[PDB]
Ligand binder design. Structure first.
Ligand SMILES: CCCCCCCCCNC(=O)CCNC(=O)[C@@H](O)C(C)(C)CO
Ligand SMILES: CCCCCCCCCNC(=O)CCNC(=O)[C@@H](O)C(C)(C)CO
Lengths: 307, 307
């Protein structure tokens, strides 16, 4: 029986790297690396370089596609110094490490001949404010589709891709657990915009941000390991983030491995776990590429959508 | 505020026709034309020719896209005498005339230089059998997503597009109101396959037939007119189809304009009307092109997805 997907294991995938140049320092990789992640330059070579190569084979191609419609509409040929922005979506659960994947991926595409203007945006700033969430009773549902201003989010990506000179996005504070007043992230006609989020790949009764993606990644892993990674790093933050007297969750810092584990499992169970199962996982089937990680965070298997 | 769509009126749309050749006879157009439809060669010129032109600007482009992945995967360059099939979906309510739109569209792309092998398939044969529908209690829900073997339907389009030499599809009898035993529609590596159906554009928790479309059309109209067109042609069939003593609905032939109108409105109200409102219309937002028809069946407005 035929399939739209083709699957590899690093052995295979790492080959397609061809001769793609590794433009990343190990100290540079570390500044993109997040607490918990095991990513090293090897993986960046055997996994991110082929991805980088792949993506570039399509940025030019996906171009000959807007051209076609331009040529159809009887329109000039926009400045090759400003074509249509390439949209990439990175999706996956909390703690799966999609955020590092996105940061790394940006660093790569960024330092790639030309001088590509690769921008990265997380759907975080598109969360309604704690006060707005309280009004809607969603304070315990952050991460769920309805806790985001998907209306605003669409205008953003739509704007950018439709060739605008600048689009603004709100900013979220993880320390203060809320959207920052006045904060603005301005994105000016990138060449490639990477949108990172949980349900970014979701679909609905209306054109959504995923309908604008030209390529998408879905970092994956057994729901059982993610919980581990989630909990494990809840504890780990007792001495990093929660340590700041300014943190909203500074109270978690004094917890014990035990108390913390209870706390962590409960949040996972009541929030992130459900959200992953009923919202994020059902989008996995339509991601250009899935990055399957082993319990050790190692990406040892991939799934590409050929169709 | 920017939009993914650009809208035209025939005046504008008909221009993009450029110099596309009209290879259709009025007698030929008539054999594609269905009871109720007002389509004439003019419309075929001012509306279908630009569409034909547009589509061809992308068939070649959407190609440079599978190529990219082929070049990435380190694969040869398949016979240019068998590339990847172009998939087009035509969607819309019952009686809107999407079926003629699909037939016409095939005739055009068919007679277009080269010798394109343009195949047309309706999701009809993918309906479970009356006996299977009875088992699931769906005999009064034909047309609804769950009255179709979408599993089988996907394997079909997936198969074809993944470069198979032949895929088989069941056949539906409108006269006998059921799937025909043993009937087979064999489609052999087309160049362009057109899939016509109601929810073909629908989306779900799994990769669907719409995720394989390279271009899609959605024939549209006010829900109030469609009802008119629906009813109006229920009556009209009393003397055409229902006239056959072999028809399942031969009983409708003797009805009176009145009885028939009641019968028609009831079916519309209890079946097609709901289905259109809760299933077909919510897919309209993501069709490459929408064909908006006026109460006179005239397509006097269009909406193209540029993004
Ligand atoms: C309570 C902090 C524990 C942090 C350890 C894991 C990383 C943060 C995940 N946060 C939680 O799972 C608690 C509920 N808070 C949310 O879902 C939102 O803020 C997220 C999903 C982070 C916005 O993207
Ligand atoms: C009852 C026949 C009246 C025919 C006049 C309109 C054209 C046929 C529409 N049929 C009806 O609306 C009755 C319920 N039958 C169905 O939805 C399925 O067979 C359809 C939708 C036709 C399969 O595509």
């Amino acid at each position: 029986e035929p399939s739209p997907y083709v699957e590899f294991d690093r052995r295979q995938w790492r080959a397609l790297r061809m001769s793609t140049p590794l433009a990343l320092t190990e100290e540079e990789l570390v500044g993109l690396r997040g607490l918990g992640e095991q990513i090293d330059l090897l993986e960046v070579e055997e996994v991110y370089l082929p991805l980088a190569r792949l993506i570039h084979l399509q940025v030019a191609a996906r171009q000959r596609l807007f051209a076609a419609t331009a040529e159809f509409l009887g329109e000039p040929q926009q400045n090759p110094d400003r074509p249509v922005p390439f949209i990439i979506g990175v999706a996956g659960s909390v703690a799966v490490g999609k955020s590092t994947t996105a940061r790394v991926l940006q660093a790569l595409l960024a330092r790639w001949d030309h001088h590509p203007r690769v921008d990265l945006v997380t759907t975080d700033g598109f969360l309604y404010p704690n006060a707005e969430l309280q009004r809607r009773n969603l304070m315990h549902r952050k991460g769920f589709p309805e806790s985001y201003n998907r209306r605003a989010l669409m205008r953003f990506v739509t704007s950018v891709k439709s060739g605008s000179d600048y689009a603004c996005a709100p900013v979220y504070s993880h320390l203060h657990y809320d959207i920052i007043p006045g904060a603005e992230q301005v994105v000016r006609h990138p060449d490639i915009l990477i949108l990172e989020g949980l349900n970014v790949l979701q679909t609905g009764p209306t054109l959504m941000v995923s309908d604008l993606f030209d390529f998408s990644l879905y970092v994956d892993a057994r729901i059982e390991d993610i919980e581990q990674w989630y909990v494990s790093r809840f504890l780990a933050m007792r001495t990093t983030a929660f340590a700041d007297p300014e943190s909203h969750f500074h109270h978690y810092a004094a917890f014990s491995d035990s108390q913390a584990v209870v706390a962590a499992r409960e949040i996972w169970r009541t929030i992130n776990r459900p959200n992953l199962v009923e919202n994020i996982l059902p989008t996995r089937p339509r991601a250009t590429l899935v990055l399957r990680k082993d319990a050790d965070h190692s990406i040892n298997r991939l799934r590409l959508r050929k169709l």
